[PDB]
């Protein structure tokens, strides 16, 4: 696998979104993974609909949280997902109104990364594209990240509370990292992004609930 990889440089990565006061990180994370595979396979980068997942993935809890695997399964089962254009984001939950004629991607299901395996997650990013990951984002050190390879030994790998997207990995001044796209807008972290420690014993549970769509 390559030593660094950034899928923004390949245009696999839509602009940073803002989920608002709604706990739909999992739906942003899911559409991020799907956006990546769509670009990979069509050359088309378009915004897909988290609202479609927030509204229609009954297995998930809408604005109260959800799993990305359940997102990828809904899209498979449903036989498509809408563009952001076709099913725009409200930032609050609503009735499922899946527009079939606005379907902008499909899914043959998903693969999970073996729990805790950062090397496997790295290969998944190298091989497939952007990967849906979950982390503990409850520390103040996280919430007020500016710059660097983020690392806090207070981070609990067993307390996952937030879904994000590893859009690549590399190493800056010898510190190995994950390039993580957040869904709290561009005014959080580093232009809506954080670099999180890589190969520092599964820091913040970065590899505990990692998954990618089959496309
Ligand atoms: C993302 N927005 N999200 C939901 C969330 O943060 N809420 C509303 C609290 C919550 C966290 C964990 C479990 C239940 C509720 N996070 C989210 O979906 O977290 C994972 C770990 C992906 C379930």
Residue numbers in the entry: 1 to 215
What does the paper say about this structure?
The cyanohydrazide warhead positioned centrally in the inhibitor molecule forms a covalent isothiosemicarbazide adduct with a thiol group of the catalytic Cys25. The nitrogen atom of the imidate moiety of Gü2602 is strongly stabilised by three hydrogen bonds to the backbone amide of the catalytic Cys25, carbonyl group of Gly23, and the side chain amide of Gln19. In contrast to Gü1303, there is no hydrogen bonding between Gü2602 and the Gly66 residue. However, a new hydrogen bond is formed between the backbone oxygen of Asn161 and the amide NH of Gü2602. The P2 Boc-capping group resides in the S2 subsite of mCatK and makes nonpolar interactions with Tyr67, Leu160, and Ala163. An analogous B-factor pattern was also observed for inhibitors in iCatK complexes. This finding indicated an increased flexibility and dynamic disorder of the major crystallographic conformation of the benzyl group of Gü2602, which is located in the non-primed part of the active site and oriented out of the S1 subsite. In contrast, Gü2602 primarily occupies the S2 subsite, and the N-benzyl-N-methylacetamide part (especially its benzyl moiety) is highly flexible and has two alternative types of conformations that reside in the non-primed part (the S1 subsite) or primed part (the S2’ subsite) of the active site.
Cathepsin K (CatK) is one of the most investigated cysteine cathepsins, both by academia and pharmaceutical companies. Cathepsin K (CatK) is a target for the treatment of osteoporosis, arthritis, and bone metastasis. Peptidomimetics with a cyanohydrazide warhead represent a new class of highly potent CatK inhibitors; however, their binding mechanism is unknown.
